[PDB]
Amino acid sequence: RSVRHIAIPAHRGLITDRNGEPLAVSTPVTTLWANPKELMTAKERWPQLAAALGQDTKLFADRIEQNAEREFIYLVRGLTPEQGEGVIALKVPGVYSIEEFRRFYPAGEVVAHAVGFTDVDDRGREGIELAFDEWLAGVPGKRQVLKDRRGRVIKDVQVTKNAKPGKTLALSIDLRLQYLAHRELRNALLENGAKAGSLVIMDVKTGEILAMTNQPTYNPNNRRNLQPAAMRNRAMIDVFEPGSTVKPFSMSAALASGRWKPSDIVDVYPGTLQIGRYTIRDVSRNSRQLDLTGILIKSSNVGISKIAFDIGAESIYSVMQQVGLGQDTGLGFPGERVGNLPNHRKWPKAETATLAYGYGLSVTAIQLAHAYAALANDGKSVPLSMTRVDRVPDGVQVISPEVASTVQGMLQQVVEAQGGVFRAQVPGYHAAGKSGTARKNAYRSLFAGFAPATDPRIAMVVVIDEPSKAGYFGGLVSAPVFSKVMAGALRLMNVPPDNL
Ligand SMILES: *C(=O)[C@@H](NC(=O)/C(=N\OC(C)(C)C(=O)O)c1csc(N)n1)[C@H](C=C)NC(=O)NS(=O)(=O)n1nc(C2=NC=C(O)C(=O)C2)n(CCCS(C)(=O)=O)c1=O
Known part of the structure; x- marks a missing residue:
């Protein structure tokens, strides 16, 4: 006989979308467990128990002998109450059923990368499940029990600490x-x-x-084999060169410099530009004079490079840094990448050009979308959120409203x-x-x-x-x-x- 304190598991909080649609739900699953010490007194029941669990009689008997010093082993997890009651109907001494909580993901593959998943122990392992694990998990309780020499619970004396359920999380x-x-x-x-x-x-x-x-x-409901490439939340954990999609930020620097207006012209003939051993190359090479809107329409690397030489790479780097390219989003999603916006004390000519057209810099899809959001929101960057926003935090003016408005018009023309x-x-x-x-x-x-x-x-x-x-x-x-x-x-x- 022994007086002991055992845990009371807590109910993991529900994850919903922004409108309350369920994305991750803690659902009751019937678990069958056994106490090998109690099983030793009922060997005649083992084969029927093995058959009920769909296990070979000898492997099952060997399993009970190998775990003979333990007081707990899992027999089968995730059954229906009806299925569990069938094993319990054999009335084998030392066999128990339990209702355990296990996650179900109603939208499955559709939101797998964002939501992520819990492990077999119901702990956040990936995505939001991991990132907000403290919020979602709650706090286990404590129960006082009297256990016999085999570790079998003889009496439930009292609850010393009630379990506290995890909290609901509404995603953005x-x-x-x-x-x-x-x-x-x-x-x-x-x-x-x-x-x-x-x-x-x-x-x-x-x-x-x-x-x-x-x-x-x-x-996420059937992670059996288990492809690493398929589980990557690429939008947050993969980096890429954004290339010509950063030209509106180089243009923002150009318009903010006081030296450029959209109707100013740049000569891009013959569609290439040599800078020592490096050659800047355009895709279509049948232009000469292009205006600033034209440089974006035609996606001229030569055009944006000549503008960058005039205004200097420092001004371009500053816009890209302010809109968050290659900068920490603050989100804290597991494995989220910061990327890289290269910097120099003195910017050489080739590096000034490549920065201007997004070559040699690395960003995430979330960063690039956040940068365009700032441009769209009249140059004001509102902090990112993975959760539903009721009270909108103050934004930071990263591009002047007039410049952002002009660049927006240029992009409508693109x-x-x-x-x-x-x-x-x-x-x-x-x-x-x-x-x-x-x-x-x-x-x-x-x-x-x-x-x-x-x-x-x-x-x-x-x-x-x-x-x-x-x-x-x-x-x-x-x-x-x-x-x-x-x-x-x-x-x-x-x-x-x-x-x-
Ligand atoms: C910008 O992204 C810029 N990319 C590069 O300079 C990079 N590589 O360029 C290519 C040509 C792919 C290469 O070197 O093989 C690069 C940057 S970072 C990195 N690692 N590599 C290019 C080229 C200036 N711009 C675009 O791709 N812009 S675009 O996607 O808007 N786009 N451009 C064109 C074409 N325009 C004119 C031609 O004659 C073409 O053959 C292609 N297109 C085709 C559809 C145009 S439309 C009018 O029908 O919409 C684009 O979609």
């Missing part, structure tokens, strides 16, 4: 947008025979992550002007953005933008990794994904059409 994710984004990203991977991809949607006014999806994905990225056009709305194509033979296709251009509400980033068909440019591959997902997201959010 809008499950309706998440499903839309998930489906369209999946479809684009098929259309392009691509290896992987990410799609992030952000509320430019609140800093909320409305959707965050990646391909490949996995079913989408709507003749010779522009027409595939990004959103039916019924004015949209703005910029595509990118990064050579990693192998390519990464990008589109970053926001809408409605007259009163921006949503920023979006589409990343398609290694499209394998003839088409690889961001304006061909990623821009139509932005169009479909932005049209859907605006309609779900009842955003009034502005292209009247």
Whole structure:
């Protein structure tokens, strides 16, 4: 006989989307356990118990003998009460049923990267489950018990400490947008025979992550084999060169310098520019004079480079740093990357140019979307949030409102002007953005933008990794994904059409 104190497990808090839709739920599962010390007195029952558990009689008997010094072993976890009652109906001494809490993920693969999962012990192991584990877990209680020599509970004397349930967590994710984004990203991977991809949607006014999806994905309810590539929340833990999608930030520095206006002209002939042993190269090389809007429409590396030499790389680096490229988001998601915005005491000419067109810098899809959100929100960056925001924190003015407004107009022209990225056009709305194509033979296709251009509400980033068909440019591959997902997201959010 022994007086002992045992734990009372706590109920893990519910994770919902922003509207209360369930994303991670603690559900009762029937667990069968046994005390090997008690089992030793009832050997004649073992074979029938083994048969009920679908185990070979000899392996089962060997298992009980190997664990003979233990007072607890799991027999089977995750049964239905009906299934557990069938094993309990054998009335084997030392066999017990228990209702345990186990996570179920109702949206499965659709929000797997964001939500993450719990381990077999119900502890946060990945994603939000890990990041907010303290909030979700609660505090176990304590029970006083009298145990016999075998460790069998003879009497339940009293509860010394009641368990405290974990707390509900409402994510910033809008499950309706998440499903839309998930489906369209999946479809684009098929259309392009691509290896992987990410799609992030952000509320430019609140800093909320409305959707965050990646391909490949996995079913968190059935993690049996268990692919590492499929479990990566690429939008947060993968870094990439943003390329031509950072040209609006180089343009912001240009307009803020006092030396450039959108109608100023740059001569980009013959579509290449030698700087020692390095050559800056444009894709289409049949231009001479281009205005600043033209440089973005035509995505001229030569044009943005000449502007960068004039204003200096320091001014460009400062805008990129202020909008958060290669900077800590403060989110603390497990494995989240900071990326890298290179710096120099004295910027050489080749490095000034490559910085201006997003070569040699590394960012995450969340960073790039946050930077476009700041630009869309008249230059004001609202802090990022993975949770529903009721009281919006104060933003920081990172680009002056006039400069941000001018760059927004230029980006609407990139989408709507003749010779522009027409595939990004959103039916019924004015949209703005910029595509990118990064050579990693192998390519990464990008589109970053926001809408409605007259009163921006949503920023979006589409990343398609290694499209394998003839088409690889961001304006061909990623821009139509932005169009479909932005049209859907605006309609779900009842955003009034502005292209009247
Ligand atoms: C910006 O992203 C910039 N990328 C680079 O300079 C990088 N590589 O360039 C390529 C050409 C892919 C290479 O070297 O193989 C790069 C940056 S960081 C890194 N590691 N590599 C390029 C080139 C200036 N810009 C774009 O790709 N912009 S875009 O996606 O908007 N886009 N440009 C074009 C074309 N325009 C004109 C032509 O003649 C073309 O052949 C391609 N397109 C095609 C569709 C245009 S449209 C009018 O139908 O929408 C884009 O989508």
